[PDB]
Amino acid sequence: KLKKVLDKLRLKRKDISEAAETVNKVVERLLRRMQKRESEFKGVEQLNTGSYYEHVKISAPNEFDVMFKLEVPRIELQEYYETGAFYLVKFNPLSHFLGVLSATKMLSKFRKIIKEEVKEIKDIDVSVEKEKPGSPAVTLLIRNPEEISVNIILALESKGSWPISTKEGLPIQGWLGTKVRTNLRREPFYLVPKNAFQGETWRLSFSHTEKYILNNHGIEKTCCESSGAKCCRKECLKLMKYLLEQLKKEFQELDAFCSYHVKTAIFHMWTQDPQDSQWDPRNLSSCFDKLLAFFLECLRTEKLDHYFIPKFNLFSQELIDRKSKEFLSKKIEYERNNGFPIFDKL
Amino acid sequence: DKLKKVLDKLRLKRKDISEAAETVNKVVERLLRRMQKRESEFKGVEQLNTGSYYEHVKISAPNEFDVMFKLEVPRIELQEYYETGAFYLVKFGNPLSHFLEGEVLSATKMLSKFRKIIKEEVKEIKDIDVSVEKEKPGSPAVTLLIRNPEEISVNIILALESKGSWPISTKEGLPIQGWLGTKVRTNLRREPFYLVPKQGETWRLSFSHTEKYILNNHGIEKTCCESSGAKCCRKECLKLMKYLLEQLKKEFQELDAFCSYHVKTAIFHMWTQDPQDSQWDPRNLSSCFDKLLAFFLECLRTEKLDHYFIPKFNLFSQELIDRKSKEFLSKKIEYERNNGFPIFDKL
DNA sequence: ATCTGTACATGTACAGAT
DNA sequence: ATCTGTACATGTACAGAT
DNA sequence: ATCTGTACATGTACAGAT
DNA sequence: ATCTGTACATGTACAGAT
Ligand SMILES: Nc1nc2c(ncn2[C@@H]2O[C@H](COP(=O)(O)OP(=O)(O)OP(=O)(O)O)[C@@H](O)[C@H]2O)c(=O)[nH]1
Ligand SMILES: Nc1nc2c(ncn2[C@@H]2O[C@H](COP(=O)(O)OP(=O)(O)OP(=O)(O)O)[C@@H](O)[C@H]2O)c(=O)[nH]1
Ligand SMILES: Nc1ncnc2c1ncn2[C@@H]1O[C@H](COP(=O)(O)OP(=O)(O)OP(=O)(O)O)[C@@H](O)[C@H]1O
Ligand SMILES: Nc1ncnc2c1ncn2[C@@H]1O[C@H](COP(=O)(O)OP(=O)(O)OP(=O)(O)O)[C@@H](O)[C@H]1O
Ligand SMILES: [Mg+2]
Ligand SMILES: [Mg+2]
Ligand SMILES: [Zn+2]
Numbered sequence: 226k227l228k229k230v231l232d233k234l235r236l237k238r239k240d241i242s243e244a245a246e247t248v249n250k251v252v253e254r255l256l257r258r259m260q261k262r263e264s265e266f267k268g269v270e271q272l273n274t275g276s277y278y279e280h281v282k283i284s285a286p287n288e289f290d291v292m293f294k295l296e297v298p299r300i301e302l303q304e305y306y307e308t309g310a311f312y313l314v315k316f317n318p319l320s321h322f323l324g325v326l327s328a329t330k331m332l333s334k335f336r337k338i339i340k341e342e343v344k345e346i347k348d349i350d351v352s353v354e355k356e357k358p359g360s361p362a363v364t365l366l367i368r369n370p371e372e373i374s375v376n377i378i379l380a381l382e383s384k385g386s387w388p389i390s391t392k393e394g395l396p397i398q399g400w401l402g403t404k405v406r407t408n409l410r411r412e413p414f415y416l417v418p419k420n421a422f423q424g425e426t427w428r429l430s431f432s433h434t435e436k437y438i439l440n441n442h443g444i445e446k447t448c449c450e451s452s453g454a455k456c457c458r459k460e461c462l463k464l465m466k467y468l469l470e471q472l473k474k475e476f477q478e479l480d481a482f483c484s485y486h487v488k489t490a491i492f493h494m495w496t497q498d499p500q501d502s503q504w505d506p507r508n509l510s511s512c513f514d515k516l517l518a519f520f521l522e523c524l525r526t527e528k529l530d531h532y533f534i535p536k537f538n539l540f541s542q543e544l545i546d547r548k549s550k551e552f553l554s555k556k557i558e559y560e561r562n563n564g565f566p567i568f569d570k571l
Numbered sequence: 572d573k574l575k576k577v578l579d580k581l582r583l584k585r586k587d588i589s590e591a592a593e594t595v596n597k598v599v600e601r602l603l604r605r606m607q608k609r610e611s612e613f614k615g616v617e618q619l620n621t622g623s624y625y626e627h628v629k630i631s632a633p634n635e636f637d638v639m640f641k642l643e644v645p646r647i648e649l650q651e652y653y654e655t656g657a658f659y660l661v662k663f664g665n666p667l668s669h670f671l672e673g674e675v676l677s678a679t680k681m682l683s684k685f686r687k688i689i690k691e692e693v694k695e696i697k698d699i700d701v702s703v704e705k706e707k708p709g710s711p712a713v714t715l716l717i718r719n720p721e722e723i724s725v726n727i728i729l730a731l732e733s734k735g736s737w738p739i740s741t742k743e744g745l746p747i748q749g750w751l752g753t754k755v756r757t758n759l760r761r762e763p764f765y766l767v768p769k770q771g772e773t774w775r776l777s778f779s780h781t782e783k784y785i786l787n788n789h790g791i792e793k794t795c796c797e798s799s800g801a802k803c804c805r806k807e808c809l810k811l812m813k814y815l816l817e818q819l820k821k822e823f824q825e826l827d828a829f830c831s832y833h834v835k836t837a838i839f840h841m842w843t844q845d846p847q848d849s850q851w852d853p854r855n856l857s858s859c860f861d862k863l864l865a866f867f868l869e870c871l872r873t874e875k876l877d878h879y880f881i882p883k884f885n886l887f888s889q890e891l892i893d894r895k896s897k898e899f900l901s902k903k904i905e906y907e908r909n910n911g912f913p914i915f916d917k918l
Numbered sequence: 919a920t921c922t923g924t925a926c927a928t929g930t931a932c933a934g935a936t
Numbered sequence: 937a938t939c940t941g942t943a944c945a946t947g948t949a950c951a952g953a954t
Numbered sequence: 955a956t957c958t959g960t961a962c963a964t965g966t967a968c969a970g971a972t
Numbered sequence: 973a974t975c976t977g978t979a980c981a982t983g984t985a986c987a988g989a990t
Contacts, residue, residue, distance in 0.1 A: 238966045238981060245982065260955095278983075280964060298948095384947065386928080402793040402800060407930060411946060440964075445791050446755055450963085452748035585934050585941065592942065625943080627932070645988085734987060736960075757962060761986070787932085797931080 274432035279439040328418035400499035621779035626786040678768035711767035750846035
């Protein structure tokens with residue numbers, strides 16, 4: 226039933242190989258250009274993030290997210306309108322981009338560089354997608370076997386302690402524990418040029434922390450290892466991502482929703498239900514169902530807090546209209562009470 | 572439990588911890604500073620705190636501290652000393668030339684210089700009453716005897732640090748896969764390994780750093796013994812077993828061949844056999860201690876206790892401990908066990 | 919002026935003291 | 937239950953070195 | 955500063971066993 | 973049907989060499 230859906234969603238080994246060798250060629254070349262030139266971004270390092278590198282990509286290997294992170298010292302941070310997630314950054318290579326380090330100016334140069342290197346690539350069919358305003362990504366479209374998108378995300382790396390707004394976030398104490406949380410919070414934090422001073426605004430990223438959690442998700446150390454037993458936590462994430470993707474293809478009414486909403490929700494569930502035995506593979510139906518119910522509670526209450534930044538409600542009225550949330554509840558309730566017809570279509 | 576009251580006696584006092592640590596840290600820091608002067612041969616050596624006090628299983632007074640002075644030693648090839656598994660020769664104006672004899676890094680020559688340096692710095696200390704203990708042959712330690720309120724021993728252990736992959740003899744060791752898991756084991760084995768001085772050119776592997784990690788990360792659940800987790804009694808069992816041996820050892824010289832490392836090794840095997848946190852519930856302290864005793868007894872009677880890291884090395888081989896010694900220790904453990912542990916009442 | 923090995927600054931788990 | 941000393945990891949300031 | 959080599963985790967594929 | 977064992981594939985950390 227749901228096993229058969231996961232069978233459909235499973236990536237093929239062949240497709241993984243072909244997509245990765247092409248993706249890696251392009252990425253490596255872009256990364257070399259950023260450094261083996263006296264560009265402003267000399268020093269950037271690659272950080273592979275998001276679903277393909279977390280092993281929760283579904284359907285096909287057609288979307289890759291790579292952070293190019295740049296270490297930069299000092300960095301005074303000023304919280305933007307108590308959003309929790311948005312900041313202005315303050316004071317060398319980066320002179321060209323300011324009082325205040327302008328996200329847009331810096332992203333613009335990053336983008337320009339990337340576009341130029343892409344023009345110089347003759348051995349692969351690869352263009353740069355038209356820019357989405359306010360978006361932190363430079364997005365590459367590759368062809369050949371298949372359509373493949375690659376999001377190149379510029380990121381500031383700071384080694385200071387995480388901003389105050391995150392103090393009460395990452396509530397993993399009863400699940401992964403205090404030692405894990407203390408150590409995760411000793412890692413650097415990241416700032417991505419998302420923008421709401423809207424053009425100078427940056428947004429926090431915890432993509433690195435999320436990756437660690439996806440690959441270290443059990444209360445037992447052996448969860449999902451070769452001498453442990455297999456959770457169905459990841460499988461539930463896949464099923465929920467797929468239900469939203471399918472609904473999103475059909476209804477433009479759901480444009481404001483994205484996979485990060487589902488990722489966030491399941492982090493909350495994984496915290497609510499820390500035991501590995503509450504995610505037994507034999508209870509895949511119940512587990513999926515309790516996740517659906519939780520997401521619906523989030524929709525009904527108009528409340529889904531950033532897992533890392535609790536004051537930031539991703540389902541605030543300001544970000545998603547009530548109407549949209551009620552529409553999505555209708556559609557989830559329906560699939561749920563009719564055996565998920567939408568899992569059968571293409 | 573009678574055993575809760577024993578642990579109450581064994582519990583270290585914060586006051587005593589403070590006083591001992593203030594002095595120990597002063598001495599160690601000064602010894603460590605001196606090691607990085609006048610281009611001594613040990614310049615670069617770094618401090619690694621290890622053993623029971625740093626693992627929080629020191630019992631009944633904070634009077635013995637173990638600190639490794641470890642020195643990164645890059646290009647080195649190892650030759651196993653007669654298939655022992657644990658003993659090696661080390662080979663390559665390098666600083667350590669002064670201890671070489673035909674490509675072979677002499678343990679005793681290097682330890683001798685280390686020792687000499689330490690003795691000199693100790694003479695220069697006027698703050699505190701501290702002498703250097705007479706050398707025990709084949710011991711890797713330079714041992715300091717301090718007296719502030721009371722007697723405190725500090726073992727300064729010279730150590731070579733290699734960053735290569737661990738020696739072959741350890742491949743099947745550290746069998747933590749069903750307990751702490753494969754990711755933990757892979758990562759542990761990416762840490763360096765250590766060589767300490769044990770004929771006179773022979774060195775011995777140390778895993779004191781790995782043992783410390785395991786003692787402080789000992790559960791199958793990540794929250795074992797944490798503030799939002801459940802308490803286990805693994806460390807309490809280790810303390811009771813250490814205490815039974817200590818008490819027996821101070822009364823009977825027949826037990827000179829036994830040491831606390833035997834009980835640490837045994838309990839690592841038990842922790843592997845019984846991985847679940849629920850098999851070390853605080854409420855089941857008696858059973859848990861008792862099963863540990865029974866296992867140790869089987870080790871004694873069958874003359875088999877393998878090094879946790881080096882499986883082919885039997886710490887209870889006939890060549891290391893006479894049968895008579897092992898039978899003597901079994902009778903004494905059997906006795907304590909069947910008569911209410913009277914030795915826990917002593918002194 | 920700039921650079922750096924050493925020591926301090928900050929944060930918290932662990933476990934003893936209350 | 938809460939408070940508190942030691943150990944330990946990482947970040948950052950700086951007298952002395954360059 | 956940059957690159958390879960090694961080791962093993964996380965995957966997918968499929969036969970034979972259950 | 974599911975599980976177990978082997979084979980084949982990629983990603984990732986870090987040592988040692990350059
Ligand atoms: N690794 C990583 N990728 C990110 C991050 N933020 C955004 N991205 C990528 O950038 C893409 C677009 O970012 P969004 O935040 O959706 O930005 P947008 O399209 O301007 O705006 P929305 O309509 O708000 O989605 C995402 O789909 C990811 O590929 C981040 O913090 N880390
Ligand atoms: N941290 C640490 N300390 C060690 C190590 N090996 C020995 N020591 C310390 O040095 C002391 C002496 O080591 P032993 O192996 O007992 O040497 P010995 O007593 O001469 O020899 P035995 O007769 O085999 O006991 C130990 O009790 C510890 O205090 C090691 O690998 N790491
Ligand atoms: N609004 C957001 N706030 C914070 N981080 C975000 C946000 N959107 C995306 N991210 C981060 O960027 C990564 C890439 O986002 P993306 O939208 O590609 O999804 P994904 O997690 O890779 O899943 P999929 O690509 O299959 O939909 C996420 O995994 C997450 O770490
Ligand atoms: N024979 C040995 N082989 C290998 N490592 C050993 C050996 N003896 C001791 N060690 C290591 O040296 C450390 C210090 O040894 P020591 O004899 O002080 O015991 P301990 O573990 O500190 O317990 P305690 O000192 O309270 O009896 C041990 O923790 C262990 O890591
Ligand atoms: Mg993605
Ligand atoms: Mg000791
Ligand atoms: Zn525990």
